[PDB]
Design a protein around this ligand. Structure first.
Ligand SMILES: NC(=O)N[C@H](N)C(=O)O
Ligand SMILES: NC(=O)N[C@H](N)C(=O)O
Ligand SMILES: NC(=O)N[C@H](N)C(=O)O
Ligand SMILES: NC(=O)N[C@H](N)C(=O)O
Ligand SMILES: NC(=O)N[C@H](N)C(=O)O
Ligand SMILES: NC(=O)N[C@H](N)C(=O)O
Ligand SMILES: NC(=O)N[C@H](N)C(=O)O
Ligand SMILES: [Mn+2]
Ligand SMILES: [Mn+2]
Ligand SMILES: [Mn+2]
Ligand SMILES: [Mn+2]
Ligand SMILES: [Mn+2]
Ligand SMILES: [Mn+2]
Ligand SMILES: [Mn+2]
Lengths: 258, 258, 258, 258, 258, 258, 258
């Protein structure tokens, strides 16, 4: 059951009904671990019959927003503001995209929509979407293009110095100001480089469990957890248990960090 | 009297006159607990024979200001700068609202005022208002309209997976970029979801006592207390004692969090 | 009235009936700040119509006990275990000491009873006793004896490099293994030496208010507060306000630490 | 000589030459304690033979700059950028203000220059000047003007609820976006209100010593010390010793905090 | 080889291959210690066959960028954006710079390039460069000019109050909004002044080792380490070991801090 | 060689010669992590030509000692004071046991010596062993016998609710008050129960590397590290890397906790 | 004047008289930094007319006491309790030792007296003695003897793995259960091993200044400073400045650490 654990985490919110105030969530100066018992769902404007929960916004200091969209019966999507690029990823259910030709996106599929590119996502039953939105940073006369596909369909890439498996969802072309990485770790595998860089992250754990290190903090995590990594926060991960770990990742690229 | 412990708190400033520099007030990175012994009142500009005490201003990262106005005899309110929406809530006493057909606002009464909408607040004896102001965020081709009412004359809304009785002094319409909630709790009741949302709050405890959690901090609170909650700060509350707890709450809405 | 606020503190427990869990009390590794709303009163074994509250006992690492005894109509004191000396200071009310004569100990009156010294304190109306007990550390063929006097009848002692007024209740003779000091500070005066010594303390603030520094902590204190000071806890004090400060203080002496 | 310890602290930088890396200075999120052994003097741009040291600049989130100007012989002041108002207070030595009849400014003297107001400070011997500069907040037609004077000749203002003696160096007119206060505390006195306000500060302790509370931090202070107070930082002060306390204080006013 | 350790740290990143997640790197609110096991290299845009690792960017609250650039065979640089000034220092290898003229830069050689000044770096074998870039702050009608030199050809400068040996790679004329200092400490030497200034820093320990204090933090440092010093953070260094300590240091200057 | 990495940790003291004062060791209230760069070797009393270093003694609160004896050429051992049971475990080299029989002990070989049980240890070449000495608690008439062995020659015991391979070196029979568990985890495997018990530990990681949790502190560890776990200190382990993970563990058993 | 700064420290107690509550002293769970402004001089028990200030006693968990003796005109020592060994070191002045023939002990001189060894130190001018006392841990039939010497007359000892110059005032015989090391560091030198041993210390920096690490605490120190290091606390040092560093050091040896 692909990404099942992501929408049905082992430690579920209802399990803390007799533990008032308790939460695994934390929000600090340079990072954050947002968990299922803290998601605040509420109707998404311009969207039709869709409860959405924002996990990250520029108020945190980011240049993107990362939210979860719960599309229920005969739901439709609203358009991002002007000059806002959007990326959706289906983690549960099914949704159909329409502008050049129709597309039926299911679990593990995804779509990238450039700024002001007209489109619409129409869902008949339900679909859990983890979407990233950003004010597109126009470089020269470059323009991004529509992108559609699936994680499994993407090729494995060079992971010099590392051992985790890496897939990328978007073109690395200079026009794209960000990308989405899918990283896989086998139990016992970790990051050799204790990353400290100007790039910022938005991460969703799709499968597995392990320990994430953020700054001087150590956080045991499980599929379903979300993470906000501000630029320059020391970061690291290690997968644990019997099943492997898989996480979806946001990362800004191709722009002078000045 | 209605909301008497808000203006005459069980533990008052005069009760600490022998505990040098002692205060319950805390101003942290993502939140604040402003207790009565820290309130700073100074002549409120343009107003008349009225002292004001700013509790929250954008200097904290918010996008709004919160202050207590203590109107004295033969007093009158001043006007907000240009393009600024204002909202007053009567915590004690009486005050007349003129534009028109003048209106009489008493304890638990209130009024919203579109940005610029010319209005005048005039009071005879005394009166103490809790007020919010924020530079309106014009949603393209939308506008709001003068609102007036009394908490009690507001219907109890639906609160799924939550017990507290909710009321909203303003319309959930798109025009409005913020609302004002009235959440009542019964001794022993708390918030089931440990919230983490882009939304920000400014809240006044009118009745009751309980425990508020903010980030990894827990704070015993009594009526009269005011809390500042910045975007994404984990929050939670539980009412205690014999009476019920109820607080005033500003919450930003109907605007993209980008 | 003398030592009035000592039993009627500015901030009283009832003033906190609306702040669940709130408390000024703090019990740390090398010290403690016991305040009114934490006093645990229970009937004093071997006593009559007398509730007692223990503030410090060797469970803290000390070598003595400190406690308050609220005596009431027709009440009497019980004989302290074998080989244990006792010192009683009358905070309020009246009590009669018998044994070889019988003195009428009133407010500001004290009595040191040697170990195994038959005696009895008997209160008819009501008395508040602050008392110290310790296993006496027998030296040579030295032995102590009954001491009965009043603070005002003790000469002011000069203390080099310090500006506080000092009175020592018991004789400085080698035989006594401790002494009770009375220390007065005028508003604005403070300890010039930032003490760090093997000596351990137990103190009760009878009058005034100020800042007490213990270790790396700063505590606002008012009359009625009690403090535990384990050996070597860095300590300092400053008197604030209109009125002067006065605290009763236990201090072990004349015994070689080896 | 007036404010002698202000430029000759009891605990001088020299006394610390056998303690590598030691400093009393601290810089936190909402406040700062800048002490002598931390001042970094550098030649002051556009000034003649004048060493300067910036203690506070907008890099802290403030809207004003605060610096010390050590003027030696034949030294001259330097005009500030466009739209910047300047306030100079003489702490040691003497300088001549010329622009409307030259003026000799000595210790305790001060001058306020409206933005874009041509002037010149010429010194022939030496002089220490504490100066504040800001981007004036033009409010309609209102405009400030040259203000020369002395603290002694300024009237003792009254402050409800407090006992400290206050004087405000500049007019309270709405045109002025801030004032400079002088506050006196007799030993044993302290602030009654545990201030928490939108206003921000920058201060210089000219005389005396005491304890300053900032947030949950406590700092013993002495003449010569400088403090930064960010908006909404919990603040409290107490004077101690034989001599009285005196500190210069910056404070913004007459401008909507919204 | 000059600066050999700065390229081959005593404690190399691989020495830590059996310590999962362990790193000596810290990114605090007002400073940062970036070490080798955390460096993140990636294809430097617009460059040719050169890996880069940004250490500091305006995302930390700075106004500049600092990055290590690993130029391999037949490698060439890329031009910075409009108005971005640039400074490069050779810590390893050799590279050629061309217009006005052309020079062969080897270890210890540097070149400052004014805004929009067309240039180019070309390396045949390998080179390691530490570089700083910044949005130039045009002051009036002034302009900077090409500066190419060698650390050793720079004269020792007077360090009033200090004992280290300071060189400045760039001129001090008002046109330059920054400079790069070279600071040498003999073993056991340290900074007498415990700096607190608006100037922000970017350093690279070229050789030696010792201790660095940043705020209330203390860090053992070795050649290769990199430190970020945001404005006003208290700073201090002491050199230890057999050999001397040398560190490259950026510093903003000749601009009003308002 | 076996356990080689333990005697030659990947991160060794030599790698730290350029980081003054730096050390990975931590000694806390309820636990400790002793690393190779903090070992203090001194000639063991009674022993012959043999450097020894104690890692855990009762000064820490334990009721046992643990140390590393590094027997050199022609070395011999000394006996434990009256009633001090002793267990040795060869970590590297060779040494012969004597006195019944006379078997030469080698790497991965151990020996329990009953209290007073006369014995000897002579090493011809080199030897490094880890020993545990303690005051035996006679439980009536029961008594311990000599024991010699090897790890692999020990039955892999079961472990209800666990995955780590377990082996004990001594009889679980009541006569013994302490055992020496051996534990093995495969990369990605971890303790399922966050242990909290009266028992105390003294461990040596012989192989692997992972993350150890002690209370609220997490520690990246590697072969050769040493940990002390006082009673009730919350503990947890997880192995990482390509190789397995194993450690030697002390543990009091079969005795009333009162 | 040998060790002049040891009783006339650069940062003197009187330099901090305008800083109420300020002190450099610290006292924690495993260590302590006792500075001059905290010395509590008070009549020494048994001694005749001599002020003394205890720095360390077993109350801290140690097995020895450390204290300063201020002897003046005609003032003499008092035999210590029974079975207590004493060691005195002359830091200032001179004192005569008698009991075999009298001996004049000047600065840098010392005397170790066995337990019960009758004797007496008398003074006719002035002298500052740093003394250590402990309840001698008799072992078998071993006994100690009157030791009298002088630092300079003691030989440098082999310091493998180090560079500091070491001297031991007492014989290394298994009889002595403690020794007093003299350790000298040249500017820049430091400990290579970050010790963590069962041994305990009581040190007194006699000459110079530097940085001292204890646990995760970093401390600047100067001549006259006194440090207490409890068993197993991480400890390191580094000498800084123009002049060398030297400190006296108590260290227990020759006894099973069980
Ligand atoms: N925290 C991370 O996992 N970061 C990724 N390795 C990345 O930035 O590519
Ligand atoms: N603090 C609160 O009461 N928050 C509300 N539950 C809200 O944000 O809707
Ligand atoms: N803290 C104190 O009260 N100290 C007293 N001066 C004392 O130890 O005598
Ligand atoms: N902290 C302060 O000194 N506050 C001043 N009394 C003031 O705000 O006026
Ligand atoms: N950290 C430093 O070394 N700073 C330099 N002394 C400087 O700012 O000039
Ligand atoms: N820390 C440990 O691994 N403890 C073992 N599981 C044990 O006590 O058996
Ligand atoms: N902290 C110390 O100075 N330790 C000494 N080197 C010692 O234990 O010998
Ligand atoms: Mn990353
Ligand atoms: Mn909320
Ligand atoms: Mn004391
Ligand atoms: Mn203020
Ligand atoms: Mn600097
Ligand atoms: Mn265990
Ligand atoms: Mn040591």
């Amino acid at each position: 059951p692909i990404y099942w654990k992501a929408t049905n985490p082992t430690l579920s919110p209802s399990h803390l009904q007799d533990l008032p105030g308790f939460t695994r969530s934390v929000y600090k100066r340079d990072h954050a671990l947002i968990t299922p018992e803290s998601h605040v769902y509420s109707p998404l404007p311009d969207w039709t019959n869709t409860l959405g929960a924002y996990l990250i916004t520029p108020a945190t200091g980011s240049h993107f927003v990362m939210y979860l969209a719960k599309m229920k019966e005969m739901s439709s999507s609203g358009l991002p503001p002007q000059d806002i690029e959007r990326l959706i990823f289906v983690v549960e259910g099914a949704v159909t995209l329409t502008n050049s030709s129709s597309k039926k996106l299911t679990v593990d599929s995804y779509a990238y929509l450039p700024p002001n590119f007209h489109h619409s996502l129409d869902c008949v039953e339900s679909a859990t979407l983890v979407v990233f939105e950003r004010r597109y940073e126009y470089l020269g006369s470059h323009t991004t293009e529509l992108i559609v596909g699936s994680t499994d369909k993407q090729p494995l890439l060079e992971t010099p110095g590392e051992v985790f498996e890496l897939r990328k969802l978007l073109p690395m072309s200079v026009a794209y100001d960000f990308n989405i990485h899918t990283m896989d770790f086998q139990p016992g595998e970790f990051l050799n480089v204790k990353e400290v860089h100007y790039n910022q992250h938005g991460l969703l754990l799709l499968e597995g469990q392990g320990i994430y290190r953020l700054g001087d903090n150590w956080y045991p995590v499980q599929a379903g957890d979300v993470i906000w990594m501000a630029p320059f926060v020391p970061q690291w991960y290690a997968a644990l248990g019997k099943t492997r770990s898989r996480y979806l990742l946001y990362k800004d690229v191709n722009r002078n960090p000045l």
